[PDB]
Amino acid sequence: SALFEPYTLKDVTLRNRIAIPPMCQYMAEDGLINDWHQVHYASMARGGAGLLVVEATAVAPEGRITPGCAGIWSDAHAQAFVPVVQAIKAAGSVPGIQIAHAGRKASANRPWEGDDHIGADDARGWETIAPSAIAFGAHLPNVPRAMTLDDIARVKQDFVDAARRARDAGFEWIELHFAHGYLGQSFFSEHSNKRTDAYGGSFDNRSRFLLETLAAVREVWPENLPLTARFGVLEYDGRDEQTLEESIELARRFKAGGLDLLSVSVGFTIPETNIPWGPAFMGPIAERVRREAKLPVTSAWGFGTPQLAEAALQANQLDLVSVGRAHLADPHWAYFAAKELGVEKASWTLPAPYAHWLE
Template identity: 75%
Template sequence: MSTLFDPFTLKDVTLRNRIAASPMCQYSAVDGMPNDWHRVHVPALARGGAGLVIVEATAVSPEGRITPGCTGLWNDAQAEALAAVAREIEAAGSVPGIQIGHAGRKASANRPWEGDDHIAADDPRGWETIAPSAIAYGGGLPKVPRAMTKADIDRVRGDFVAAAKRARDAGFKWLTLHFAHGYLAQ
């Protein structure tokens, strides 16, 4: 157990200990914009002593959000708001990290407490989903996504690159890519 509290260095990033606060979706953003909830809650994890605090799965594009309440990093205003979160994490002694991703066929879903299923087709809060193939995820996510074209692949790849650059410029020192449990991998 003694190594748990020892510093850990990876390349030029040193964590004060080996405790990491994993990215946890908050579903509290509006139009991808982090707000006071994020500026208070996420840095509190750093004040709790974690060596690394990773901001929730953050969409690289509007259609890449899991839900309407997910944070985004597809524009400079979002990057500026997330920079404030990164500064607070760092001020509390932790390394600021962020997870970026694209929900693919699992996008356009309701928040968990609203049903955790796809937003109805006639609901204006929803959006078109994309995936490598036009096959629904299944279960409570029955929406059939549009199969991606080569142009879609190029655009989404560019969205990941742009979001990663915005994250770096916003002060995040650790980046994870969300490619798990059915999300779009690049």
């Protein structure tokens, strides 16, 4: 099975091609993770996935999506991840982390608590920042403050500090969150970036925040550990061919800047879109990015059907298959996939206290 072939990137070897993508849990307090996360991550790692990327973790307090989001903006926050890192490793999986800044989508309620921007009278709220003072709209109507050059410098340094902290906590894999309409994505998109300085307008300028952030992180993140990013390569906004072309060019520049792998996603920069949701619908997009930018890729959405994951690898549409919600449903999904694909000794996808009894 292609899905259960190991994968080596820099000094890291994954035991199979199953990655658990970052999935916000909204259970942290003042950015500090706790026993929710400890059990959540350890259980999934024991389930057999070769790579576990920890949820979007804010590089600064205002960069959280919600009051429940994890943060790594201080050494205390980073130390809280050490038991998570070590439990993932103990399980034979590789611990990664996505570091993030929610931009204009920040200061929002938890998804099961309204999922909308926090009211101005609610003491939990905070001022959001973005390339330009323009709201997402719909359920996220808060207008962000437009960043100054000083803000841009500060946020880049926050990403740097976060990467250093992630390194020291023992993460072996880092992912810069440049997707899903948050700060990085919003600098790239003309929808959200109306700047007239060096960080807006042209393709070079819109790319600049992302390339400078990558370059600054590259300086402190070890050369022998995978340096990756998630990036929305189209919006399904009627501008897809031009947007894909630009995004793929940016992926070439990421590779020139030392990126080892790109997690290919959708922009979600604005609500006025028409996304053709379906099983494995990103497969062909990811394949094009992989082939044209000549960079390893992963992608997600609907690959919880093991045959779809296997087919995507056999078609060389991606190098790792990210399986998200199916792991929330079943933390041992990797074992389920091994059985479904007829892997020899499938139960030993799991540790011995389970594997012995399930064979």
